[PDB]
């Protein structure tokens, strides 16, 4: 049994990260090809650390310890080591005597201020070299010395990242093999005609954050004198004929030279965020030179102190024939009129329009249907009313998550109006819109009494997000015009639900013949009007977490005893976070017999009636994590032949009954972590049959490592293929001389 790592198997990974290791383990399998030792407490690497492990092609030593001392030549023996990750190790230098086999080396987030021939010029197979984020913001550090011609040797180098270092000039003598060159936030003020003249293979150039626009910066930001623009020679990009990505965000551009793009016939992504380009947006010649451009980001180009009535888009936007996505967040303007987006309306592939964070107060919605074919109309975070801190592997200037959840966007055209002030829905709000399938009205503080007409103009919504509002369910016909609805999210509408004296009608749920997923979480539901039962022939999943089943199922009240029984198709039910101390037997018995997955985690349960599992013959997963359960039934084998996964972590169990690990015929995964087990008896292991488990989780119990643990230790050896994860965290609490050892120590 592999220790302290967990092995996964076109290569074999030893997962050994975040395990408190104070040394490289000397027990790595000889068949391992990738070794992850990140996030431990390792302080020395030498030539003995990985002795003879010639199958290792990748080693991850990021974030050690929690500086890392690597001797000269420590890795030199590894003849096929290709990838070495040494991020966030407080290194003062590039380690010497690295193996010539390397194709990827990462030294991100260290204290390296000297890039030398001695450290890298021998690494002639290098393909990707990451040196970003060694000297930046208000760190105490030195300007980076790049030894003249250090990279010139590296004739296979395709990616070089030097961002977030103090460089002052583009390094000379770069190899023409480069494809991707990242020089963001390097304090370069001037790009010469010579800087990139031989980089005829380059596909990506990142010059962002040189002469930055520092107003309202979320980091320590140092502008060029006067807040001046980066200075880019007219001929700087003359031979960059392979460029697809160009990042000039936060370079304090006021002017774009259209002829910069004369010899980039492939440019596909242009990032121009956080500049001063309102004037170029209105009249820019560069827009005519980009007929293959797919993504244009012009976000945060606002004029400080200016709140113009309208956005001013050049007619030359009509020449962006391949455009797919246009991001215009943070331009800052009051009203969007149809005439204002005329230049975009014939572009055949413009599918995403992003107008987030513009403080727009009014939109002429009819305009969107006159575009050729929008699929994402993203208007989140405006003012519409009724009609180390930075991840070095992510984008610095924006989030990269999808604008609209993929599960909602998969249904078809999407309109996102979240985080505005559309506090009620008037009879004309959705007039003249495309056939919207995905609608987001989250966080509009909406208090509407939905009554069956409000979405009549967009009646084919399939995924509706009404979260974080204050909906008032006073009318049983709410939402019944949406006949095709499949997903409804009503999470965080507690406002009226918490008030006993107003009405709460959830009758409408029965009207949907296509509804599959319903989220009622965090509504503080404790009382309903007239009809006490939820009913649906179609619903498969109900999330009811964060409500008050403790009240609904109070022992003095019989009204809600079948609240979910009428969800005749239900397979997944989440009752977590409902303050439950015990469930009435009759209420448990009235849960739908169709259930396969039942979550009751994070309640306060001291009692569970196991016998009632006899009435759920399709139940595969039962989650009771995070409760106060003091004991387990001794008869689970009599109550289920379907249960596959039983999650019981974070309870107060101190004894495992006879047969618990063997007798349930279908049980594969049993999580008993973070309970109060001191031992596991022989009788628990085996009765008439032998275990069918494939995973048993036990970390965080106070095991007693006397000879009384001997039967379980022998059982572990007889049953190697029962995975017990985190053996390093399956720790003797006693006796004193064994405290802190994994139970897997001692004999």
Ligand X SMILES: *[C@@H]1O[C@H](CO)[C@@H](O)[C@H](O)[C@H]1NC(C)=O
Ligand Y SMILES: *[C@@H]1O[C@H](CO)[C@@H](O[C@@H]2O[C@H](CO)[C@@H](O[C@@H]3O[C@H](CO)[C@@H](O)[C@H](O)[C@@H]3O)[C@H](O)[C@H]2NC(C)=O)[C@H](O)[C@H]1NC(C)=O
Ligand Z SMILES: CCCCc1cc2c(o1)c(N)nc1ccccc12
Residues that bind its own copies (CB under 8 A): 9, 12, 31, 33, 54-55, 79-80, 101, 125, 265-266, 348, 373, 435, 513-514, 617, 641, 665-666, 689-690, 692, 694, 721
Q: Nearest CA to 272 among 291, 289, 242, 297? A: 297
Helix (H, G, I), strand (E, B) or coil at 318: helix
Query: Using the rule CB under 6 A, which residue among 191, 246, 419, 539 binds ligand Y?
Result: 419
Angle value at C-alpha 348, between 344 and 353, nearest 5 degrees: 50
Kindly state the tokens that stand for 131. 């040196």
Q: Nearest CA to 61 among 97, 25, 29? A: 25
Beta strands 517-519; 541-543: pairing state: parallel
* Span near ligand Y by CB under 6 A; candidates 108-116, 485-493, 596-604, 613-621: 485-493
- Interface ranges with ligand X (CB under 6 A): 30-31, 44, 46, 52-55, 69, 71, 155, 176-177, 201, 203, 242, 321-322, 338, 342, 345-346, 348-349, 370, 411-412, 435, 437, 451-453, 460, 475-477, 480, 510-511, 516, 537-538, 540, 568-569, 585, 589, 594, 609, 611-612, 690-692, 694, 719, 721-722
112 part of the interface to ligand Z, by CB under 6 A: no
**Cα(453)–Cα(471) distance, integer angstroms:** 15
The answer, yes or no, to whether the previous bond of 65 is cis (omega within 30 of 0) is yes
Residue nearest to ligand Z (CB): 359
**Cα(417)–Cα(444) distance, integer angstroms:** 8
407 part of the interface to ligand Y, by CB under 6 A: yes
359 binds, among ligand Z, ligand Y, its own copies, none (CB under 5 to 8 A by kind): ligand Z
Query: Using the rule CB under 6 A, which residue among 359, 390, 397, 423 binds ligand Z?
Result: 359
Q: Nearest CA to 666 among 688, 691, 648? A: 691
Query: Using the rule CB under 6 A, which residue among 109, 354, 418, 429 binds ligand Y?
Result: 418
Q: DSSP secondary-structure letter at 369?
A: G
Angle value at C-alpha 83, between 79 and 88, nearest 5 degrees: 130
The answer, yes or no, to whether the previous bond of 4 is cis (omega within 30 of 0) is yes
Q: How far is the CB of 482 from ligand X (least distance, A)?
A: 11
Q: How far is the CB of 462 from ligand Y (least distance, A)?
A: 10
Query: Using the rule CB under 6 A, which residue among 261, 302, 378, 497 binds ligand Z?
Result: 302
Is the separation of the CB atoms in 484 and 462 below 8 Å? Answer: yes
464 part of the interface to ligand Z, by CB under 6 A: no
Q: How far is the CB of 444 from ligand Z (least distance, A)?
A: 17
Q: Which is nearer to its own copies, 80 or 407 (CB)?
A: 80
Q: How far is the CB of 281 from ligand Z (least distance, A)?
A: 15
Phi then psi for residue 142, to 5 deg, are -110, 155
Q: How far is CA 486 from CA 125, 333, 385, 411, 412, in A?
A: 53, 36, 27, 10, 13
Q: How far is the CB of 734 from ligand X (least distance, A)?
A: 28
Judged by CB under 6 A, the chain residues 518 through 557 that form the site for ligand Y are 519, 521, 541, 543
139 binds, among its own copies, ligand Y, ligand X, none (CB under 5 to 8 A by kind): none
275 binds, among ligand X, its own copies, ligand Y, none (CB under 5 to 8 A by kind): none
* CB-count exposure of residue 643 (10 Å: 0-12, 13-18, 19+): buried
Q: How far is the CB of 564 from ligand Y (least distance, A)?
A: 16
Each residue of 127-140: b (16+ CB within 10 Å) or e?
A: bbbbbbbbbbeeee
Q: DSSP secondary-structure letter at 120?
A: H
Q: Which residues bind ligand Z (CB under 6 A)?
A: 302, 307, 330, 332, 357, 359
Q: Which residues bind ligand Y (CB under 6 A)?
A: 380, 401, 404-405, 407-408, 418-419, 440, 442-443, 465, 467, 487, 489, 491, 517, 519, 521, 541, 543
């Amino acid at each position: 049994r592999s220790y302290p790592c967990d092995e996964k198997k076109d290569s074999v990974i030893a997962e050994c990260s975040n395990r408190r290791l104070q040394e490289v383990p000397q027990t790595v399998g000889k068949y391992v090809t990738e070794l992850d030792l990140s996030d431990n407490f390792i302080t020395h690497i030498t030539n003995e650390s990985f002795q003879g492990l010639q199958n290792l092609t990748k080693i991850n030593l990021n974030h050690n310890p929690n500086g890392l001392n690597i001797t000269d030549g420590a890795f030199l023996n590894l003849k096929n080591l290709r990838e070495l990750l040494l991020e966030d190790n407080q290194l003062p230098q590039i380690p010497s005597g690295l193996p010539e086999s390397l194709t990827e080396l990462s030294l991100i987030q260290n204290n390296i201020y000297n890039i030398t021939k001695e450290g890298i010029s021998r690494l002639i197979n290098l393909k990707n070299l990451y040196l970003a984020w060694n000297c930046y913001f208000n760190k105490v550090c030195e300007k980076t010395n790049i030894e003249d011609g250090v990279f010139e040797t590296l004739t296979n180098l395709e990616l070089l990242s030097l961002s977030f270092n103090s460089l002052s000039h583009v390094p000379p003598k770069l190899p023409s093999s480069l494809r991707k060159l990242f020089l963001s936030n390097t304090q370069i003020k001037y790009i010469s005609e010579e800087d990139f003249k031989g980089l005829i293979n380059l596909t990506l150039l990142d010059l962002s954050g040189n002469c930055p626009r520092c107003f309202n910066a979320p980091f320590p930001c140092v502008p060029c004198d006067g807040g001046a623009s980066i200075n880019i020679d007219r001929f700087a990009f003359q031979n960059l004929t392979q460029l697809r990505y160009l990042n000039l965000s936060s370079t304090s551009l006021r002017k774009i030279n259209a002829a910069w793009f004369k010899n980039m016939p492939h440019l596909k992504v242009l990032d121009l965020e956080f500049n001063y380009l309102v004037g170029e947006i209105a009249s820019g010649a560069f827009l005519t030179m980009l007929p293959r451009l797919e993504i244009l980001d012009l976000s945060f180009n606002y004029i400080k102190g200016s709140y113009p009535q309208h956005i001013n888009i050049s007619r030359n936007f009509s020449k962006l024939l391949s455009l797919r996505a246009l991001h215009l967040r943070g331009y800052v303007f009051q009203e969007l009129r149809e005439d204002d987006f005329q230049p975009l309306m014939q572009l055949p592939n413009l599918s995403t329009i992003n107008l987030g964070i513009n403080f727009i107060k009014q939109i002429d919605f009819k305009l969107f249907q006159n575009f050729s074919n929008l699929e994402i109309i993203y208007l989140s975070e405006n003012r519409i009313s009724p009609l180390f801190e930075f991840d070095p592997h992510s984008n610095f200037y924006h989030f990269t998550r999808p604008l609209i959840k993929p599960q909602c966007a998969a249904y078809g055209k999407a309109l996102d109006l979240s985080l505005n002030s559309i506090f009620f829905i008037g009879p004309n709000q959705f007039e003249n819109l495309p056939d919207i399938a995905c609608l987001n009205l989250s966080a509009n503080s909406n208090a509407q009494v939905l009554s069956g007409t409000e979405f009549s103009a967009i009646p084919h919504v399939k995924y509706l997000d009404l979260t974080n509002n204050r909906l008032d369910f006073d009318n049983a016909s709410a939402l019944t015009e949406l006949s095709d609805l499949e997903v409804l999210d009503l999470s965080y509408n507690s406002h009226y639900f918490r008030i006993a004296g107003v009405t709460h009608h959830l009758e409408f749920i029965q009207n949907f013949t296509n509804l599959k997923v319903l989220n009622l979480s965090h509504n503080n539901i404790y009382t309903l009007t007239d009809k006490y039962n939820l009913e649906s022939k179609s619903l498969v999943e109900l999330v009811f977490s964060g409500n008050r089943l403790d009240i609904l199922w109070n022992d003095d009240d019989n009204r809600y005893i079948s609240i979910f029984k009428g969800l005749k198709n239900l397979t997944r039910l989440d009752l977590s976070l409902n303050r439950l101390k015990h469930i009435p037997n009759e209420a448990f018995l009235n849960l739908p017999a169709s259930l396969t997955e039942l979550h009751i985690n994070d309640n306060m349960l001291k009692f569970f009636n196991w016998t009632l599992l006899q009435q759920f013959p399709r139940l595969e997963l039962l989650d009771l994590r995070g409760n106060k359960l003091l004991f387990l039934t001794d008869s689970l084998s009599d109550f289920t032949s379907s249960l596959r996964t039983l999650l019981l972590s974070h309870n107060r169990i101190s004894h495992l009954p006879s047969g618990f690990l063997s007798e349930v015929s279908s049980l594969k995964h049993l999580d008993l972590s973070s309970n109060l087990l001191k031992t596991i008896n022989k009788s628990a292991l085996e009765t008439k049959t032998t275990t069918k488990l494939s995973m048993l989780e036990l970390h965080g119990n106070p095991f007693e490592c006397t000879c009384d643990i001997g039967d379980f230790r022998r059982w572990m050896d007889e049953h190697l293929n029962v995975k017990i994860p985190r053996l390093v965290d399956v720790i003797c609490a006693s006796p004193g001389d064994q405290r802190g050892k994994s139970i897997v120590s001692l004999e």
